[PDB]
Amino acid sequence: TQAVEAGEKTVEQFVQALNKGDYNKAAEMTSKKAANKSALSEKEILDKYQNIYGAADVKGLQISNLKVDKKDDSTYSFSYKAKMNTSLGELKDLSYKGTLDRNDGQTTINWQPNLVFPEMEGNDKVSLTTQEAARGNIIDRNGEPLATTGKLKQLLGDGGEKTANIKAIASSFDLTEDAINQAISQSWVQPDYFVPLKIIELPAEVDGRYYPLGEAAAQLIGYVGDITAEDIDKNPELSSNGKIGRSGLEMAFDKDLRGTTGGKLSITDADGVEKKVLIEHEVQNGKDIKLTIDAKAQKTAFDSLGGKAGSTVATTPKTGDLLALASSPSYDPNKMTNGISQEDYKAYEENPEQPFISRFATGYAPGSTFKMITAAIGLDNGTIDPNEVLTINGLKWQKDSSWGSYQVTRVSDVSQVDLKTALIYSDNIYMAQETLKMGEKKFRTGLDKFIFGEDLDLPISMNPAQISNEDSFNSDILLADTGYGQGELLINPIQQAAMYSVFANNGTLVYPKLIADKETKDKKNVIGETAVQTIVPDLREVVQDVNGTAHSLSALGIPLAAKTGTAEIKEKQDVKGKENSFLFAFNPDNQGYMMVSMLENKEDDDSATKRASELLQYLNQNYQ
Numbered sequence: 028t029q030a031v032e033a034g035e036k037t038v039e040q041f042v043q044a045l046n047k048g049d050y051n052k053a054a055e056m057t058s059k060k061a062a063n064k065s066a067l068s069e070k071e072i073l074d075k076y077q078n079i080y081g082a083a084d085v086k087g088l089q090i091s092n093l094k095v096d097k098k099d100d101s102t103y104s105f106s107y108k109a110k111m112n113t114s115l116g117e118l119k120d121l122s123y124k125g126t127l128d129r130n131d132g133q134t135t136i137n138w139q140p141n142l143v144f145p146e147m148e149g150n151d152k153v154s155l156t157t158q159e160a161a162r163g164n165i166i167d168r169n170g171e172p173l174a175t176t177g178k179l180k181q182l183l184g185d186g187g188e189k190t191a192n193i194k195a196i197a198s199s200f201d202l203t204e205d206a207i208n209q210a211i212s213q214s215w216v217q218p219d220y221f222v223p224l225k226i227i228e229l230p231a232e233v234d235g236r237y238y239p240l241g242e243a244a245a246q247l248i249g250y251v252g253d254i255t256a257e258d259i260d261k262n263p264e265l266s267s268n269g270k271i272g273r274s275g276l277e278m279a280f281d282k283d284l285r286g287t288t289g290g291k292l293s294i295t296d297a298d299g300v301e302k303k304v305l306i307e308h309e310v311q312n313g314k315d316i317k318l319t320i321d322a323k324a325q326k327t328a329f330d331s332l333g334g335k336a337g338s339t340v341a342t343t344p345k346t347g348d349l350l351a352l353a354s355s356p357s358y359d360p361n362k363m364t365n366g367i368s369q370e371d372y373k374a375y376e377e378n379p380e381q382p383f384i385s386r387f388a389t390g391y392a393p394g395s396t397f398k399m400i401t402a403a404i405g406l407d408n409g410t411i412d413p414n415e416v417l418t419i420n421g422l423k424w425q426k427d428s429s430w431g432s433y434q435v436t437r438v439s440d441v442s443q444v445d446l447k448t449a450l451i452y453s454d455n456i457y458m459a460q461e462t463l464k465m466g467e468k469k470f471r472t473g474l475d476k477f478i479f480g481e482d483l484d485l486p487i488s489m490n491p492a493q494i495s496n497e498d499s500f501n502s503d504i505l506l507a508d509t510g511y512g513q514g515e516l517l518i519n520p521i522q523q524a525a526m527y528s529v530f531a532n533n534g535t536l537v538y539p540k541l542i543a544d545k546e547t548k549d550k551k552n553v554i555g556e557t558a559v560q561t562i563v564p565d566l567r568e569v570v571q572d573v574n575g576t577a578h579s580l581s582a583l584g585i586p587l588a589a590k591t592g593t594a595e596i597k598e599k600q601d602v603k604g605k606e607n608s609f610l611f612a613f614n615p616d617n618q619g620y621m622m623v624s625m626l627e628n629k630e631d632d633d634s635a636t637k638r639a640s641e642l643l644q645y646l647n648q649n650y651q
């Protein structure tokens with residue numbers, strides 16, 4: 028069985044050459060063109076595999092159950108099962124048969140047309156008919172469309188009137204006259220060709236993906252683009268004529284939204300009469316995805332940012348339903364999927380504010396809002412006494428002279444500061460001293476009860492939140508900075524709304540949900556209910572007290588428990604200093620809604636609190 032083992036290696040190498048797409052390397056392993064030998068020459072075998080497998084997008088040829096016996100003195104027979112992936116699914120349970128020849132020092136394959144497909148003979152052809160599948164829709168929690176397939180409206184003389192009509196079309200549709208003449212002067216433009224320019228009197232209808240909210244949900248939903256030849260080579264089950272999700276939920280849910288391509292792959296005779304049907308199944312359209320998003324809250328949350336850098340997360344904290352996931356600035360997903368110029372796409376990538384960033388999934392330093400967690404931990408382990416009054420003199424403070432020139436800084440010079448006063452004025456010195464007295468060991472014990480290091484079950488690409496870089500602070504300064512939300516903390520707004528949901532469930536952390544049909548997941552006993560009933564009344568005073576940092580929100584006249592914060596970061600690209608503004612707020616009477624808004628690289632005298640009056644009214648009216 029020495030020459031028999033060489034024949035098994037020849038069959039294995041022939042299949043591997045077909046699997047890797049190198050049809051020339053597979054054809055060179057066949058015998059000469061003759062009777063009882065190879066049916067075609069090496070060059071003819073190359074063109075037949077390249078035409079047939081290329082038309083069906085065959086990829087991943089895998090065989091099994093190989094058996095190679097011996098027939099004649101110089102003829103060896105082989106047989107094996109095989110499976111392959113085509114553009115209409117996986118072809119499985121294929122019985123292949125053939126013979127080999129070892130007329131010298133090497134062993135070749137007596138190639139026959141039945142080695143392409145099992146029942147092919149002589150000059151048989153292969154026909155493939157496909158039916159494109161309609162992409163499914165993305166809807167909100169009330170059925171409003173967020174990503175649908177609509178019918179769009181896509182928008183000549185001789186000499187002088189032609190140039191005058193171009194100037195008339197550029198001024199009647201807010202278009203550049205230098206681009207209208209550039210569209211009709213492209214290399215692909217032939218004399219009487221309709222050159223499309225932009226979508227919506229006519230001087231001298233097509234189907235496509237449509238996003239109703241547009242930029243208000245561009246980071247969350249995403250966009251779809253034309254499928255390329257490289258996309259088919261990676262996944263043949265795609266439609267080489269349709270769309271593929273490029274970012275956002277259009278990409279994360281691309282498999283469920285695109286459906287499956289339908290049609291028939293059959294073998295015909297020399298004349299195109301069908302003989303054997305290999306694959307055939309009806310077209311299955313893409314399923315719709317229903318989100319927890321509120322279409323009216325998503326638009327309001329985005330418009331409240333006013334085009335500045337920031338993000339806003341609105342949830343129902345008792346169930347976790349993500350009502351709004353806004354990010355600003357944003358891009359136009361309709362222009363992104365229906366043709367965009369090289370200048371407009373470069374303007375989105377070269378924009379320093381980066382509109383492509385999903386800021387609700389980007390890890391930031393939580394700021395002074397994180398004092399709610401440090402206080403709740405201090406109340407659980409008995410370190411923080413709600414009535415204990417610390418004496419703080421001045422605006423700067425340090426533990427001892429070993430800190431050098433670093434001092435914890437506060438804004439309000441209040442001499443008598445207890446826990447309630449610290450949350451109203453956002454006193455960093457108070458929380459810094461209570462964190463040091465708490466100790467790193469007991470501080471991490473309360474932090475580990477949260478979602479630090481956990482990857483949330485959400486169709487949004489993000490990194491898990493962290494307490495610090497390593498498992499130990501190993502620095503009293505870093506321990507204090509982590510007390511009031513600075514240091515090496517990295518928590519994205521979605522993870523902040525999850526950690527802050529304990530104050531709406533009496534110490535129970537409710538994980539956020541984006542899909543409407545998913546079951547509510549929670550984590551009980553994260554913080555004590557006693558700490559909730561102590562901090563939440565103080566969070567009311569952050570809005571109601573006249574010296575509260577969120578006193579401008581008392582104008583709403585609705586029950587609110589809030590906590591603001593303005594974290595300052597080291598920018599390096601700018602040595603003046605960059606500060607982010609944060610705001611957390613929820614209804615402490617019914618726990619119907621919860622809001623976490625931020626303002627990245629804020630302007631002076633600007634804050635997320637100033638821009639939250641509109642969204643807080645809608646969430647209080649429609650989510651009790």
Ligand SMILES: *C(=O)[C@@H](NC(=O)Cc1ccccc1)[C@@H]1N[C@@H](C(=O)O)C(C)(C)S1
Nearest residue numbers: 394395438452453576591592593594595
């Ligand atoms: C929490 O992050 C605190 N921020 C600082 O100490 C940094 C800072 C604050 C103001 C100006 C420059 C640097 C507190 N959070 C904010 C807030 O809650 O709005 C305060 C201004 C109260 S300090």
